[PDB]
Amino acid sequence: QVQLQESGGGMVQPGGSLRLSCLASGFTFSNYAMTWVRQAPGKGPEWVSMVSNNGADTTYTDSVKGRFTISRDNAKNTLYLRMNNVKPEDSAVYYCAKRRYGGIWTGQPTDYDYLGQGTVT
């Protein structure tokens, strides 16, 4: 069944890096686009990044360009996110989610499935 278990997070120091991994099982992976959506304690969630099926169409938030790099590997059906130059405000709980459709721009960023975990710095 569809489950998304993420890991790779932990404590770091400001200005560092982190490599977040997301393992999905239960569905056809190569067909659906994926999203990272974070939530800071106290503020409602905000989408971090949206990545395509081909891995060629990628989109980030207006405040994280140049610092992040989202990607995916279709062999193990897994999702990679590289965060560099961690600002103190990126300190939030990150979430890996599977888009409704196989698109990225068709429809506003919202998801319809479960979640794993996320660390804070």
């Binding site: 190569s30 067909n31 099926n53 081909n54 891995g55 060629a56 169409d57 990225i104």
Partner: peptide, 21 residues
């Protein structure tokens, strides 16, 4: 800088993707 490409409809674009990427 390999620019983006449209959605991945089913029949061959999946195969074309998993080849080119």
């Amino acid at each position: 800088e390999l620019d983006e490409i449209g959605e991945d409809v089913a029949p061959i674009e999946y195969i074309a993707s998993m080849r080119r990427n």
